[PDB]
Structure formats: C-alpha cells, structure tokens
Amino acid sequence: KILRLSGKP
Amino acid sequence: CMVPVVFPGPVQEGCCQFTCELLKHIMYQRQQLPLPYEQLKHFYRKCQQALAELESVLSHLEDFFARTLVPRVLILLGGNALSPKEFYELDLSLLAPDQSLSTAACLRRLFRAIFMADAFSELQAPPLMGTVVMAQGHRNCGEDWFRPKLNYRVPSRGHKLTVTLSCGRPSIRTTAWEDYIWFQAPVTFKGFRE
Amino acid sequence: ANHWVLPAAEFHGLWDSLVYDVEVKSHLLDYVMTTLLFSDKNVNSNLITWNRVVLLHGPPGTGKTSLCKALAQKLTIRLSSRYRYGQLIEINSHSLFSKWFSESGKLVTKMFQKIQDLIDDKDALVFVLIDQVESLTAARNACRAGTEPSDAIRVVNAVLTQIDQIKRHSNVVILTTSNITEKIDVAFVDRADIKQYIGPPSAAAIFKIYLSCLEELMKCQIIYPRQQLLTLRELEMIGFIENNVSKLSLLLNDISRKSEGLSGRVLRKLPFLAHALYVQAPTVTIEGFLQALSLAVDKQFEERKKLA
Amino acid sequence: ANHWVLPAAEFHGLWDSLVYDVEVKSHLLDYVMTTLLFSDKNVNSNLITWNRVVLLHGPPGTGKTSLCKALAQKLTIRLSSRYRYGQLIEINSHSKLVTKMFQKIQDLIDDKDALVFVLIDQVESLTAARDAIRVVNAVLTQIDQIKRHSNVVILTTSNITEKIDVAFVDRADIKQYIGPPSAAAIFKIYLSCLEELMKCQIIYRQQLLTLRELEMIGFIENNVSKLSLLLNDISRKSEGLSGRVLRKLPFLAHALYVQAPTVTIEGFLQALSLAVDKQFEE
Amino acid sequence: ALQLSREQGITLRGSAEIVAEFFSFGINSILYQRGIYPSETFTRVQKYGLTLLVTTDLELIKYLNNVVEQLKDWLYKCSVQKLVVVISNIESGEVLERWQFDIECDKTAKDDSAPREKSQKAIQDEIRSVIRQITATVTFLPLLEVSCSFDLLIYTDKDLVVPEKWEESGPQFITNSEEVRLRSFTTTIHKVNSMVAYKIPVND
Ligand SMILES: Nc1ncnc2c1ncn2[C@@H]1O[C@H](COP(=O)(O)OP(=O)(O)OP(O)(O)=S)[C@@H](O)[C@H]1O
C-alpha cells in the first residue's frame, strides 16, 4: 500500500 | 466552447504580460516549440532563428501595449490573415488603465481557469505550422513595427477558443473602441520541432 | 501444413501414373539417390555446389505436385536399406503466414519444431514439399514499400535459414514446385542445385497413359467388352503393320501423335470427356470410344484456339 | 571484418593461383603501381584522374576478392621499398564495428611504410537485403575522407554487375570487367572437386596433374595427362559457366552416369564432358 | 498499388512498459519545472514524438529506474492502484504539492491473451496530451517561495507482494489544499486518472 523508499537530498 | 475570465481587480501593464504568457503558453500547447518559452532559456539553425523571431514579436508587443490599449488580440495558426487553420481570440475590451494585487496573481488565476477551461483537448498532434499574432490599436497611434489591415475581419471558422475577461467593472461604452483598427504582425512566426 | 506417412495406399501406382520421355524421372531419382549417398561417402560440401534442394518448373497442371510426391515415394522404397519410414510435410506457405508477429512466432515454433524434431529421427528419411515457390518469393524485393517487410521477409528468409538449418542435416529432401518459370525469388532459385524443367508430355508417354486409362475403363468395366492393347515398342517391332488385331493400338498411337502438348491434366482428363460429350451412352464397346476420344482431343485443341 | 599482414604466409602464393583470360595480372599491377606513384606527390587531384579504388564485377566468386588479396600480396612484393610493411582488412557486409574499424585503419595509415589496403566484399550488395544505414554512410564518409592518405589503397569488390548506385562506384576512376575464368582456372576448380572426391575414394587413384604439372611434363599425353585435352574438351565450350554452375557440374556428372558408389575417374570425366555438353546445348 | 494495415496488438506487459516510461518522463519533467531540483543540471531527449526533460542525478536515476521496473512488475500483476508524488518543505517539511495518479489495470489480462484494438499512435498521442497538460499546469501552480523536497507514495492493495526495502507509511494529506484534475488516459488495460493537490494560498 503506502510504501516508501529513500529520497536523496 | 467559450470561456471568459473573472477578475475582482482592474489593471494597466498587466494586459501586456497577459498576452505575452498566453501567446507563449499557446504556441507550446500547439507543439510549435519543443518547450515553453519560459524554459527555453537553455540551448541558447531553425531553433534559435525561430526563437528570435518570437522574441522580436514579444518585444514589439510590449512596445505596442505600452503605446496604447487593446480590446482584442488575435493569434493565428496557418491559413492566412483572413482565414486560419485555427485561431485564438484574447479579449482585452473590458479594461481601462488601481490594482494593488500582483500581476502574477492574475496570470495564475487566469491560467488555472484556462486549465479548467479544459482547452487544448486535441489528441490530434498538429503538424509544424505557421503563426501570426494580431490585435487592435489606436486609430492614430503612429505604430511602426506592426501594420494595420483596414479591410480585416475576424474569420469565423476553426474557433478553437476566444479567451475573454471580466475585471468586475460595471458597464463601459463601445465607441471607445470603434475608432481602433487591427494591426498585424509584420512577420509570420514559424514553429519548429525535431 | 499437413502430415504424410511414407508408403500408404494413397501413393500406390502413384509413380507409374506419370510418365516422362527421357525418363528424366530417373535423372532426378538417382540424382537424389546420390545426393544422400554423398554424406555416407564422407564428403565435404562447400568446395562443390550441391545441396539437398529440388526445384521443378514448367507449364502448370503438369503433375509437378503429384510428380514430386511420387518421387518421394519411390525414393522411400529405394532407401529401405537406409531408413525405415519418414515424413512428408505439406508446407502450404499460404497457410504459413498470419497477421501479427506472435502469429509468426506460433508459426515458426509449431511448424519448424515439428519439422526439425522429425528430422532427428535417424531411421526416418525426411521429405519436404513447397508447392508454391512463388509464395516464397511473395516478397520479391522490387518495391520502395514492399508491403511493410519488417514482419514478412524476416521470417521468409528465416524459413530459408530454417531450410538452411534443416539442410544442415543429411537425411533431408526439399522439394519445390512453381507452375511458373518467369518470376522466382532471387537467392533461392539461386539455391538451385536442381533447376528441373518439365515439358509437354510427348507421344510415347501419351500412348502409355492412354493404355492405362483404357485398361482402367476396362477393369472398371466402363469399356464392357475387354480387348487387347499394345505398346509402341511392340507396335514398332511389328513395324506398325496394319493387321486386324494391332489396328486399335495403331489408332491410339496416331491419337497420341496428333495429341501433343495439351497437359498431363488434359490427357488423363480426356477419357472423361470422351465418354461424356460424344459417347454420352453407358457403353462404348470400342472404336466408338476411340473416335470419341479423337473428337474430344479435337475439341481441346479447337478451344485452346478459341480462348482467343 | 578481419586482418592480414602483407606478405606473411597466410595467402603466400595465391598470386599466380588465379590465371585470368585477358594479362590482367601484369595489367592490374599498373593500377596500384601507378596509383602509389601519384599518391606519393599529391598531384593535381582536381585535375588529374586518380582514386585508389580497385573495382571489378562479374560472376561472383571468380577469384575477385581473392585477386584483391593476392594483389595486396604482390604489391608489397613489388614494392616493399615504399612500404616496409602494410595492413590488409576484411570489411564485411555482414554487420559499432565500423567506427573502431576505420580507427584501426587510421592506425594503419599512421606509417609511411604501412601499405594500407581497404578490402570490402560485395560493396554494393549493401542494398541487397534492404538499421545498418549509419554503417553504410560511415563507411562511405571514411572512404571519401581517408583517400588523401598516401599509403591508403581501397580494394572494393562489386559482387554485383552494373547494378551499383551513386555513392560507391561512379566515384571510381579505374574499373574492369572479366568474364568466365580460363581453361586453367576451370581446371583448378575441377581439381578442388577431384581432391574432395579422392578424399575418401568417392571417385576412385591418379593424383591431379595440375596446370604447371601439365606444363613441366612437356605434354606427355599419357595415363592421366589426357585430362588436359578432355579438360580442354570440358573447357572447349565451358566459356559461359558460373562458379556456382562450375562446381555444380561434377556433382551433376556423378548424378547422371555414375549412379554408383564410385567409378574410375575416366568414366566420370567423359561423363562430365557429356554433362557440360547438355549444359551448353541449353 | 496497395497498402495494408498491420496492427500489432497490445499486451499486459507492453502496457506496463509504456506507462512505466510514461511516469518516468512525467516525474522527470514535474520535478524539473516547479524548481524541486537543479533545473540547469538536466537536459532533453526525444520521446513520444516530442521533447522531454531528463535528469542526470545518478542517485535519482537508479532510484526511479528501480521504481519503473517495479511498477512494470506490479502492472504485469495489476498490483498497484495509486501513484502519488508528495512534495514538501525542506526542514519544516510541510506538504505543498501532491500529484495523485490513480491506477486501473486489467485483471482479465489473465485470460485476455488476445490483443486489443488500440494503436501506438493513439496511446502515444494521448500520453502527449498528458505531458503537454502537466507542462501547462505550471502556469498556475502557486510558485514555491522556498526550495522543496519530495517523497514517493503509492497504494498497492496487496500488503502481500512487498519486496524488501519498501516500508509501510502514512496517508500524508494536506489541510488547506485545492485539488484539480487533469485529463485521463488509458490502455484499455491500464487507465490512470490524475489530479494535483496543492496547499491553498494563505493570502489572495
Ligand atoms: N505426366 C503426367 N502423367 C500422368 N498424369 C499426369 C501427368 N502430369 C499430370 N498428370 C495428372 O494431371 C493432374 C496434375 O496434377 P498437379 O500435380 O496439380 O499438376 P501440377 O503440375 O502439380 O500443377 P500444380 O500447379 O502443381 S497444381 C493429376 O491428376 C495427375 O495425375
């Protein structure tokens, strides 16, 4: 469902 | 279809950049240029020369609006001056030279409207075509770069969209316009692509 | 595409049903006989123009289909010492193609899969048939837009590579028929280790086929009273001398002579019209059927003249 | 897309191995023997008619590419002086390879004693089975752009007769057409066949009295030398064959009259005589 | 004198491919235009018979490639149904922008082996509609008075097929945000509705 990974700075 | 625009506040130089960004927006949304002119600032033969065509257009437009007022602006695609492949009308009739709001606010309001005006709904990718812009001007404003068309008439076919305004002013005359006369862009814009 | 087993009752009498003068039948026969025999003589290939591909060409309706089939049959029996049985696969090029690319996929997979994996049968001898070479030149490169070839030729020549692949075996017999000699694929009619012309079946063959058809009338009792026919060899030994016994065969000879270049099809058709147009009776005893045959051949020639 | 060093022994001797009808050995020498003459001093190019592009055409596989190769050979042979070595290249229509290929060719050009050669098979057959288009035009531009290098030699091979487009060979400056190979080369191809056959008693022996062997023996028409005359017989009207049909012939002969696991060669010989007799009754 | 239609057809997985690169380039352009990332550092390519904004952030390049293929997968199994890109502030991280893409797939694609009548022309021009539309949308999105960052939300109905590095998270609404819908577009297998939510301005 609501699934995230690392958004780079 | 037909779409006006609702503003609470009046203007003066707003009209200028209104037409500017509208023209730009359009020429993009008809594929004539690969990217919006606001972002074409990259990449500095047909490309730069046509873009400079467009820039001269824009500049003299600003000149013209600075000189006098405009009731109506015309932008053509193909055809000729007296008949388009398609066209867009931009009403400024409802404006006089007031405002403390930001010009950008009117821009984004009107463009959000355009989006909600649902225009440019044609899956049919048109080919690369020719473009001319026109508008009315003072009877005697001594305009130079443009040129009048004393026999001109609005053609009545391929009415893509007349963008119309409303600044919330009660009721104005029409004689203040009956003296004015269409001028024409001296050089046809061409829209390229690769 | 269809699937034949080697000798079955379909193809009995199939060889001798067809006749050709110089017995170039034999030429083709021992030709392919040696063609296969090479791989068993331990021979290389590239230094010498040869493959296992067969092409016949000439006037259409000349048994060429039947001819190659009976050829395969005779070869089969002549190679009992080398293979038990085998397959003959009708590759109806017409039935080959289909619209989209996944259809070409199912095409190549099912058909050439069957072909290949049958060729693996080292006790089966392989025979392949291509009824319409013209249908493999169906994309003969001559156009600025040869009907969007980026799906067609890529498989057609793939077929050729398939052909290549399969001719990479030893036990493969590829047969090809045209029914036209004018326009044929480049680089495939170049792969022409057989350019086999067939012509109008001339007299002696016509005579033998007459004999066969007549005795098939007789056996089947169409000709109710049986009589005695002869061979042109036998007729020549007695010197065509008109007795009251060899006369009928002399008449048959003359009919054959005057019956040149119609077709194998027209010939083995003849008896039918002979019985229908002019006889038009259930019994023909003899020399009425014969003159009827005469008039029928006459009708065929007149009408070739009448096709304007 | 292969490599060759000059005279190194890969094709050492291929030179005389292709005797042709109409002196083209000593003739075609002139081509490069004078091409490099003119290529040295940068003559009035605009004026004076030269390129560096060998080109013939004819029945395919007629020792054409082979003569190109043995030609590079003999060119170094005659002219190791102007070139203490050199580099031959197979440029294959089978096809990026082109970019680094012509880069390597630049490397070859880098040296004054590197007799560069540009060998391309079936040069116009590029338009036979037609996204190799950039391959086409890259090879084209490289051709027209590395011509000015004096050690460059362009070995083009038509493999198509007179069906050549503009970009390639109307560009040429020296051409030639040659028909079927001589009785000699016909004999050599027969020899290839008869060696393949005497490989396993296929036709069974008498070693093949080759052409120079025919010459050294002073024409002692005997057990095997009869080949010659029958050769000439099987070369009498053989003028008009194709290499395909050439090598096809012994096959067909063995098909007609042998019908056997093997015959003594002489039967096969008269058989192929009669087979070619058929083939030019046509 | 003839021609011929040769219609190729469409596949579950082909739809997945094309719509995957759809989102690829669309995300590229969105995050290009509003100022989310360094614009100057990017460039253009030719795709969809038009010109497209493409990044060079190897980090985000590989990241979004992973996302693209993973979505290709989940389309090939109709797994996901929402695709959102939530843009927020840097430090206070307040959400300003939220591009919601609501996804429809074809369950029957299990049995829908035979193709469906629809052209590369049609799909292509309709995605061109999408792209040009989104581009235009910048003309009214209230400009970012600051710099921003973003996070990537989706919604696959399955809590089942989850690969390793992906973690469950929250809805991330906005308190005062207008939502405005863009044109729709489909594959007859996958459709994607699109609508951007964005923080309602404080002052008019
Ligand atoms: N030389 C022949 N001898 C006897 N019968 C023949 C001969 N040639 C043809 N026929 C017969 O006439 C018919 C010819 O059959 P086909 O094989 O179709 O002819 P064809 O040469 O193959 O023409 P196509 O184009 O291949 S169908 C068959 O019924 C054969 O039995």
Side-chain angles (χ1 to χ4, degrees), chain A, chain B, chain C residues 1-139 142 145-184 187-188 190-304 308, chain D residues 1-168 170-282, chain E:
Chain A
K1 293 180 182 179
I2 298 170
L3 299 174
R4 295 189 181 184
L5 285 182
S6 66
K8 279 73 64 182
Chain B
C1 183
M2 291 296 293
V3 175
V5 173
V6 177
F7 284 163
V11 74
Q12 181 181 2
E13 291 183 354
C15 303
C16 177
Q17 297 179 357
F18 297 167
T19 298
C20 292
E21 184 71 26
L22 179 62
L23 169 64
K24 295 179 183 180
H25 180 73
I26 294 168
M27 295 181 294
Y28 178 75
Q29 297 302 322
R30 303 296 295 168
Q31 298 170 355
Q32 304 300 322
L33 295 175
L35 291 176
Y37 181 75
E38 187 65 26
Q39 286 186 353
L40 294 178
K41 298 297 291 183
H42 302 287
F43 59 84
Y44 294 98
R45 177 65 68 194
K46 297 292 186 181
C47 178
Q48 298 299 321
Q49 189 57 254
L51 193 148
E53 174 71 21
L54 181 58
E55 292 188 354
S56 177
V57 172
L58 298 172
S59 177
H60 297 92
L61 291 169
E62 298 184 356
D63 299 332
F64 187 81
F65 290 101
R67 291 184 182 274
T68 186
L69 288 173
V70 172
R72 293 173 74 185
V73 178
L74 296 178
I75 294 168
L76 296 179
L77 286 78
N80 64 358
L82 297 172
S83 175
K85 295 293 290 183
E86 65 183 3
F87 71 97
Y88 288 94
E89 183 178 1
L90 178 57
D91 183 75
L92 291 175
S93 66
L94 298 180
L95 296 174
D98 288 329
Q99 64 182 358
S100 178
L101 54 85
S102 65
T103 298
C106 288
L107 292 172
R108 69 177 67 90
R109 183 176 178 87
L110 190 149
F111 294 158
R112 184 182 65 194
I114 293 174
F115 183 75
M116 298 302 290
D118 199 2
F120 300 97
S121 64
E122 299 81 7
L123 302 175
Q124 185 63 41
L128 300 178
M129 299 172 72
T131 299
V132 175
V133 179
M134 291 175 70
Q136 289 187 358
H138 184 270
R139 189 180 71 186
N140 300 321
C141 63
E143 177 64 25
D144 191 77
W145 196 73
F146 293 163
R147 292 174 184 175
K149 300 291 286 186
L150 295 177
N151 294 320
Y152 180 76
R153 297 175 297 171
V154 176
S156 66
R157 292 184 182 274
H159 186 278
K160 293 295 289 184
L161 177 62
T162 294
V163 173
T164 310
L165 296 178
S166 68
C167 66
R169 70 189 299 164
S171 64
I172 309 299
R173 67 185 69 186
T174 185
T175 61
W177 301 111
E178 291 181 353
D179 295 333
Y180 290 176
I181 48 175
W182 298 101
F183 298 165
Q184 181 171 359
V187 290
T188 298
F189 177 81
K190 183 176 177 180
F192 67 90
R193 186 179 56 78
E194 293 179 352
Chain C
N2 283 321
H3 189 275
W4 283 278
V5 178
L6 294 181
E10 290 180 353
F11 298 160
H12 180 73
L14 188 66
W15 176 254
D16 291 330
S17 64
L18 314 170
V19 178
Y20 298 98
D21 303 335
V22 183
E23 295 176 353
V24 182
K25 299 180 284 189
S26 299
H27 299 174
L28 179 58
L29 179 62
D30 62 359
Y31 178 96
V32 182
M33 182 67 203
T34 306
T35 305
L36 294 181
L37 183 62
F38 286 114
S39 180
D40 197 3
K41 294 293 183 180
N42 191 359
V43 189
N44 190 357
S45 67
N46 294 320
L47 291 175
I48 294 169
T49 299
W50 69 273
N51 70 13
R52 298 178 178 92
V53 176
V54 179
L55 175 59
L56 276 70
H57 64 88
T62 310
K64 289 192 267 71
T65 308
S66 302
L67 186 56
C68 297
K69 290 186 180 180
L71 177 72
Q73 183 69 37
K74 183 63 69 179
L75 288 170
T76 298
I77 290 173
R78 293 291 178 89
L79 292 179
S80 67
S81 66
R82 189 177 292 174
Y83 294 103
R84 291 182 180 177
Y85 63 95
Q87 291 299 324
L88 176 60
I89 301 303
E90 182 176 359
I91 298 170
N92 190 358
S93 63
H94 173 270
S95 71
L96 181 146
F97 295 96
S98 54
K99 72 283 290 180
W100 59 74
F101 186 76
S102 176
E103 292 290 326
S104 68
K106 68 179 283 188
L107 186 160
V108 176
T109 55
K110 285 186 179 181
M111 173 257 285
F112 295 110
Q113 183 74 41
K114 291 181 180 180
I115 297 170
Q116 179 66 42
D117 296 334
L118 288 174
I119 309 164
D120 290 331
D121 190 358
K122 298 296 183 181
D123 289 330
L125 185 59
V126 175
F127 286 86
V128 173
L129 181 60
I130 301 303
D131 195 0
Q132 292 83 15
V133 181
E134 65 277 19
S135 181
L136 292 178
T137 196
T147 62
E148 298 181 353
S150 68
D151 284 328
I153 299 172
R154 63 180 292 169
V155 177
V156 176
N157 62 8
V159 175
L160 305 177
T161 67
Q162 301 294 324
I163 294 170
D164 290 328
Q165 294 295 323
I166 66 174
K167 72 176 74 174
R168 293 176 182 179
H169 300 87
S170 295
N171 58 4
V172 173
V173 177
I174 296 168
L175 300 177
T176 53
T177 62
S178 173
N179 282 317
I180 55 93
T181 62
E182 185 173 359
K183 60 188 178 186
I184 301 94
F188 180 74
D190 195 4
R191 285 186 298 271
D193 293 334
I194 291 177
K195 292 180 184 176
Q196 187 59 47
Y197 180 75
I198 303 301
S202 69
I206 302 170
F207 179 80
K208 295 181 182 180
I209 297 166
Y210 281 163
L211 296 173
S212 65
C213 296
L214 294 173
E215 288 296 329
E216 180 62 24
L217 296 163
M218 299 174 188
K219 181 180 181 293
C220 292
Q221 302 171 358
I222 299 168
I223 300 170
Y224 179 76
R226 181 66 58 80
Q227 290 82 20
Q228 298 299 109
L229 299 178
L230 300 172
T231 67
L232 289 180
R233 184 173 179 177
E234 182 177 2
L235 293 174
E236 286 176 350
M237 291 190 287
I238 64 169
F240 294 168
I241 295 171
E242 172 60 25
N243 64 6
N244 293 319
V245 180
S246 64
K247 180 179 178 181
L248 302 178
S249 297
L250 297 178
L251 179 62
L252 194 68
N253 184 3
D254 296 331
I255 300 163
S256 298
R257 295 180 185 271
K258 68 184 180 182
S259 300
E260 291 183 355
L262 296 173
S263 79
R265 185 180 305 282
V266 178
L267 294 179
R268 283 187 182 275
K269 169 62 186 69
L270 289 171
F272 190 86
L273 291 180
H275 190 280
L277 290 170
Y278 296 94
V279 169
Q280 61 181 354
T283 305
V284 304
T285 62
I286 192 66
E287 295 101 12
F289 184 82
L290 301 177
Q291 63 179 355
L293 180 72
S294 174
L295 294 176
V297 177
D298 297 330
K299 192 170 184 179
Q300 291 300 319
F301 277 95
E302 290 179 355
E303 289 164 350
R304 285 183 183 270
Chain D
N2 289 316
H3 185 275
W4 286 273
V5 178
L6 289 170
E10 290 185 355
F11 290 164
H12 183 76
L14 183 65
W15 177 249
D16 290 332
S17 70
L18 297 174
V19 178
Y20 289 100
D21 287 329
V22 177
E23 294 179 353
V24 174
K25 293 187 284 186
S26 297
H27 293 170
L28 188 59
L29 170 61
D30 73 355
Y31 182 78
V32 175
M33 183 64 203
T34 306
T35 306
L36 296 179
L37 172 65
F38 283 91
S39 182
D40 187 3
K41 307 294 183 183
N42 195 357
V43 191
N44 280 125
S45 63
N46 292 108
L47 289 178
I48 308 171
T49 306
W50 61 267
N51 61 5
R52 299 178 176 92
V53 176
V54 177
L55 185 59
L56 280 76
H57 57 85
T62 310
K64 297 173 265 70
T65 303
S66 300
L67 182 58
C68 296
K69 296 177 181 179
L71 179 60
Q73 178 69 39
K74 181 54 68 181
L75 288 171
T76 312
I77 293 171
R78 303 295 187 93
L79 300 175
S80 67
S81 66
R82 191 176 294 172
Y83 297 101
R84 295 181 179 179
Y85 66 95
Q87 304 299 321
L88 176 61
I89 296 298
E90 182 178 2
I91 297 168
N92 186 355
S93 176
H94 297 286
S95 63
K96 184 67 175 176
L97 191 151
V98 173
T99 62
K100 289 184 179 180
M101 181 180 71
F102 288 103
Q103 182 63 40
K104 295 177 184 178
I105 292 170
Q106 173 64 40
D107 286 330
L108 312 179
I109 296 166
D110 294 331
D111 192 0
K112 296 290 184 180
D113 280 332
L115 181 54
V116 180
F117 286 102
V118 180
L119 180 61
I120 305 166
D121 192 78
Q122 61 176 354
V123 296
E124 65 267 10
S125 177
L126 295 175
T127 185
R130 179 175 63 84
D131 289 328
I133 292 169
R134 183 177 179 178
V135 172
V136 175
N137 65 8
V139 175
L140 291 175
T141 59
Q142 293 296 322
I143 292 167
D144 291 334
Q145 288 174 357
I146 68 172
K147 289 176 182 177
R148 295 181 184 179
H149 297 285
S150 293
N151 61 3
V152 169
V153 178
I154 299 171
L155 303 176
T156 58
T157 62
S158 175
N159 198 0
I160 291 173
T161 66
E162 295 175 353
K163 291 182 181 179
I164 306 170
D165 292 334
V166 173
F168 302 97
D170 294 330
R171 178 180 59 194
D173 294 333
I174 295 172
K175 301 176 184 179
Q176 180 62 42
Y177 176 73
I178 298 297
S182 176
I186 297 167
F187 182 70
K188 287 183 180 179
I189 294 169
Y190 292 167
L191 298 179
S192 65
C193 297
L194 297 173
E195 293 295 328
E196 175 64 27
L197 297 167
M198 293 180 183
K199 183 179 183 294
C200 298
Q201 293 181 355
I202 306 159
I203 294 173
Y204 183 76
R205 290 179 182 177
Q206 297 297 324
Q207 68 178 356
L208 300 176
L209 298 179
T210 67
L211 297 166
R212 190 177 184 180
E213 294 172 355
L214 301 180
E215 295 176 351
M216 294 182 288
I217 59 171
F219 296 166
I220 297 168
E221 180 176 0
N222 62 4
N223 296 319
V224 183
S225 178
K226 184 178 180 181
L227 288 175
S228 297
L229 298 179
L230 194 60
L231 169 68
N232 192 359
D233 295 332
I234 304 171
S235 298
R236 185 179 295 276
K237 66 181 183 177
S238 294
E239 184 176 0
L241 293 167
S242 73
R244 185 179 298 280
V245 174
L246 282 170
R247 296 183 180 278
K248 181 69 179 294
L249 291 171
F251 174 77
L252 296 179
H254 192 275
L256 286 175
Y257 300 104
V258 174
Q259 295 183 357
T262 291
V263 71
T264 65
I265 188 167
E266 297 81 2
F268 174 76
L269 298 171
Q270 62 188 358
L272 183 55
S273 175
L274 299 175
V276 177
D277 295 330
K278 175 181 176 179
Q279 293 295 321
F280 283 103
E281 293 173 356
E282 299 173 353
Chain E
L2 71 88
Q3 292 180 358
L4 60 95
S5 60
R6 188 174 70 239
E7 181 176 357
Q8 301 174 358
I10 66 169
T11 65
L12 172 63
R13 192 171 178 272
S15 175
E17 174 184 1
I18 295 170
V19 182
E21 66 178 0
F22 166 82
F23 292 113
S24 174
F25 289 95
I27 294 165
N28 290 316
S29 297
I30 294 173
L31 302 181
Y32 177 82
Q33 294 188 356
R34 296 297 298 165
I36 305 302
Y37 278 162
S39 63
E40 68 283 15
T41 59
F42 299 159
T43 183
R44 282 84 64 187
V45 302
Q46 287 304 109
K47 179 62 177 177
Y48 297 100
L50 60 93
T51 303
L52 288 175
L53 278 301
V54 293
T55 181
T56 59
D57 182 76
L58 302 175
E59 302 170 354
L60 189 63
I61 290 172
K62 295 180 177 67
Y63 183 80
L64 298 179
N65 294 316
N66 300 316
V67 178
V68 165
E69 178 59 30
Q70 191 64 38
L71 295 177
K72 184 184 287 184
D73 178 72
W74 291 353
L75 296 174
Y76 191 77
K77 287 184 173 66
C78 298
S79 300
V80 69
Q81 296 80 17
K82 288 185 180 179
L83 172 57
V84 182
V85 178
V86 176
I87 294 173
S88 298
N89 189 358
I90 299 170
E91 183 66 30
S92 66
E94 182 175 0
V95 178
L96 298 176
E97 181 175 359
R98 184 175 184 271
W99 296 93
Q100 181 179 2
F101 297 158
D102 295 330
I103 308 163
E104 294 177 353
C105 187
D106 186 0
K107 296 181 177 67
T108 67
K110 292 182 181 180
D111 283 333
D112 291 332
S113 298
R116 292 178 181 176
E117 294 176 354
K118 196 172 184 180
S119 71
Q120 296 300 111
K121 184 267 180 182
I123 299 172
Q124 183 179 3
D125 286 328
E126 295 182 356
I127 286 173
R128 178 177 294 114
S129 175
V130 176
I131 298 166
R132 297 177 292 115
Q133 195 180 9
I134 299 169
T135 305
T137 58
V138 72
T139 60
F140 66 94
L141 296 174
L143 277 72
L144 296 174
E145 295 181 355
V146 301
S147 296
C148 293
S149 65
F150 71 96
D151 196 359
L152 298 182
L153 295 176
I154 64 97
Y155 180 78
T156 181
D157 56 357
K158 294 187 290 294
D159 289 330
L160 302 174
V161 71
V162 176
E164 53 184 359
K165 289 183 180 179
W166 294 92
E167 300 86 3
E168 295 179 355
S169 176
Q172 192 64 258
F173 288 97
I174 307 168
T175 301
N176 285 320
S177 65
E178 182 179 1
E179 62 185 3
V180 293
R181 183 180 295 173
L182 290 72
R183 289 181 178 87
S184 64
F185 68 99
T186 186
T187 64
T188 62
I189 289 171
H190 298 92
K191 185 179 184 293
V192 172
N193 292 317
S194 296
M195 177 174 67
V196 66
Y198 66 95
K199 185 174 182 180
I200 295 167
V202 175
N203 288 318
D204 292 333

